[model samples]
Target chain A: MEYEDLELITIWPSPTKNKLCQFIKQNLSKEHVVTQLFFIDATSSFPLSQFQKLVPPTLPENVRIYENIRINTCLDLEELSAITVKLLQILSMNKINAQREPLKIILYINGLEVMFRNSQFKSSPQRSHELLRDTLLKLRVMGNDENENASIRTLLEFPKEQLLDYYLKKNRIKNGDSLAEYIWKYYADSLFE
Target chain B: LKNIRIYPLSNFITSTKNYINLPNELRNLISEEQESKLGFLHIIESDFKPSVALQKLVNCTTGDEKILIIDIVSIWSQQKQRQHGAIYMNSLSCINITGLIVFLELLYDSPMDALRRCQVNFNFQLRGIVIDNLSFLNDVINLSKFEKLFKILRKLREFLGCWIITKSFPTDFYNGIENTLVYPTKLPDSYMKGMDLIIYREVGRPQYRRI
Candidate 1:
């Protein structure tokens, strides 16, 4: 993979929680890639019972290959940071040292806004910005070495509320649905005319 | 000795890997300091996870090493702006008796009411003191009052042999401090002159400058 491709790919106007998990399952089911997937579930409500159902169907001997995936559920940034560090350390030891082709490292994070919303103490957005930047840098650094045959990419899901707020504020509209209807009423009819 | 003995950096790091690790500068600063009675002013922006770092420090407590947290930000309890509770504070309840927290109450009639409220319960073992969000008083109190509070904290640290940890926002009037660390934002050189460490959380890596 090109070095340029090794960057955070955000899912804006984030999909529903179930759809997010479905995408994750679909991403994992790919047998061609030698992938290391790290899923951080900041929202505690992630259905754990679905794990058995979600795992890709494979041969009995090949089932153990999914061990490279790490699924951690945490409440706040502290726990998230610790989990990220621990997983990265393991990734470095397990995968980075032994360079191989078709290697891809993916960090999939969901529901991060919950932690910030739940926090009692408040500071500037720059703080959380740095924390996320730091985490991404740590993940992105794995693919930095020119000799290393690995590409790192992070799938970051924007929290729905934040996405909605952005959409509302940018368009100066009270309701998102109204904006869509406005486009259909005004702009769509003009195109036909 | 009612002081929390700041152990070497290695003591806090475990192979288990789940515990939040202290910032290297913070660890070394605490470890190198021979004096237990010290003041630490942490100027933070959002998301630095200072509370988690403090949690790791509190977890290093030996026998009878109690730490007290004074939450000044939640002073306006009756107001709609009041927070439910700090995440770390709530989690502390599940842990041992090492942590004691009090929400500073703001009485419109008495501006200094929160300070006096905490004065009543000083008889217990408090080896470390954390004033959560000290900048809450920036608008209410002047520099003179700020010094009075800091002076009292200094005396308490000396008399009780305890370390003090407090935080403030960059915009707040948080000048003239000791053992301070500002994260993710850099203030003017004069504002950070008294600080022990100034950390700029940059794009790739964090830049740490020590006085």
Candidate 2:
């Protein structure tokens, strides 16, 4: 089944609190099966450790953590839908849509880079960092206006400087050169050539 | 008790409106407490792999000497089923031992009452089945189940009226009557009492309302 066809079940206000645990334990059992589990916390309420701790040891391994994406909890369905679609794209491809889905993309890209480097190649930290930076710039250029959706246009049309700043802040990029300058320096020559 | 003088008597008031109002030294103390209460908790702000976020929490919290307690009860069974194909596996459906019973027993109390409640509720029945089938009630107290209990405790703190405190504390400390811990059921009475206190304090008059 297509990813979209797969039903997504979001558990709002995760049953992590005391009464809810009582409620859940009283109600649900291990035999119950669910396709997808979404814990809705605009702020990603339940901490990852908390989830790791509470999950019964008997659970199988395929239940991978699909997306721990964070969006403002206050967003309406329309906004959430747009965000979810953006997330789907990023999940399908590690590269985030810098131009259109600025915040979401930046966060995902930066997080993935950090995760990839820290876990997969712990010994070569510098390699992971550089790879992330390069990948981000490449994705920026590749995600040109040709594939621009309304969201992308809205993002790109935002003040170029501001857009750059948004990504920098989102990624917590703290290198000497500004993110804009860094991206331009790295990709401008290649793109122009 | 009379001789005991609490330093910075203002600290105990619990009525400081803003951080600025307090003296610099007092502000520092309050800020320390504020920071302490806020605690250093990290949220996974992106849709990256779970391991990434988990590692960060582990590293950051561990590095800072903060206790890292996990609450995985809710997703435990489902995730296990997904990974092992135990319960959901059509061919191995009968192989239901998922360490659930052993996990639940680790908690401070039996989850039977909670499990029963969940089973009775139509909306919650599926979740109940998931918990029941896991049989977390068996064996040593399951630390995992206790963590799940904490999740519910947090919810109760938010939506419910009563705070889960130590058993030693008088259940009705607020009033002489028993069972006075403010919970949803006690909200009306608590509200009326609060209103009465306000009226007596501000208006210098007390009016009685019989419900």
Candidate 3:
């Protein structure tokens, strides 16, 4: 499994708070390759450094840490897919207790992605691939949205494939994989979706 | 009181193979009589059958009529003299004294008639008189007459009393007695002799004695 396959991305309306960061720091271990990217609303006053300090020091070397990115504007289906792939890769490398707190990271990422993505756009011809690409594009576009309207519209019009791709890729799941295979591939898929 | 007609020993020998396979309880019931009957049969088979032997085997004695039907045959043989003579003496001696009492007691309790019949035998009569006179004699006088018997009886009674005390009270009392009583030096030769005699009698043989 690729490093990008098991990404744990948390998209919040605001910057990562100290509580959330402390929770991640206390629970995550270096053995679990986890990425915690907070998608901040461009206008929120959440402190970036204070929140970063809460990130666990023992987190795996493969974990990528990013901040100040808007969820709607920065992360697209492809990027989400990459993050999921990375997350799954890290998870596969280590033995994880699925019933414990670390599982929350996986659940949180998928929950956010599903919530933001529109339902109608999920059924397109290339929906699976487009979803991840579109989500990342929208999130990136949101960074430049002075009024945040462009980020909103892009997310609203985004196809389900972009969201599905992001989810699948985050878990290192592939296209044409059986539902059982997908579930087995992304151990965290059922909880989030 | 119940008239149960047990089979004769002659019938047992006539059906020897069947009698050999009879159950132990049935065998014990007929054992004394069967032995007596067999003794008579053996005498008859040897061609020197005595009327006394046959009479004794079929209940000739007065005590035999009272409680127990002592149908025992007194057999004699010229050959195998020591063994046959010992058996005869033992059987007669037992019949004259405690053997009749034991037999009567085994069959029925409170055999007043059998007890009266026992008075006819000199040995039994003397033993009974001694026991009866013991109540009139003081402890010292009574003990002096049967000193050895009294000593052993006293020791046995003391041991019995201690046993009862230990059981009635607690185990601690008797715990150290086992060690004290079981030592080779402490164990009396008389006790060992008694035990040997008991074993010999039980096995129906004379025990070998070591100096």
Candidate achieving higher DockQ, 1 or 3 = 1
Cα-lDDT of candidate 1: 0.42
Off by over 4 Å in 3: A1-16, A29-47, A52-74, A95-193, B1-211
Provide the lowest-lDDT 10-residue window in model 3 chain B: B162-171
Q: If you assessed candidate 1 against the hidden native complex, which CAPRI class would it receive?
A: incorrect
Query: What value does the TM-score of chain B take for model 3?
Result: 0.15
TM-score attained by model 3: 0.19
Global lDDT for candidate 3? 0.27
lDDT tens readout by residue for model 3, B72-136: 21122112221210111112223222443353343233334433443323221100000101110
Specify the poorest-scoring 10-residue window by lDDT in model 2 chain A: A150-159
Task: Identify the candidate with maximal lDDT.
Answer: 1
Over A37-81, each residue of candidate 1 has an lDDT whose tens digit, in order, gives: 777777655444554455544556336436756777767666667
How do the residues A1-193 of candidate 3 rate in per-residue lDDT, one tens digit apiece? 1212322221222223564455444433334434333332222333456755565334553144443122422233444555544434444333334423122122223233332233214443235323433333223222212221111111111223444534555644433432222222221111223
Q: Give interface RMSD, per candidate.
A: 23.5, 25.0, 55.5
RMSD in angstroms, all models? 19.8, 25.9, 44.1
The per-model lDDT (C-alpha) reads: 0.42, 0.25, 0.27
Cα-based lDDT at residue B97, candidate 1: 16
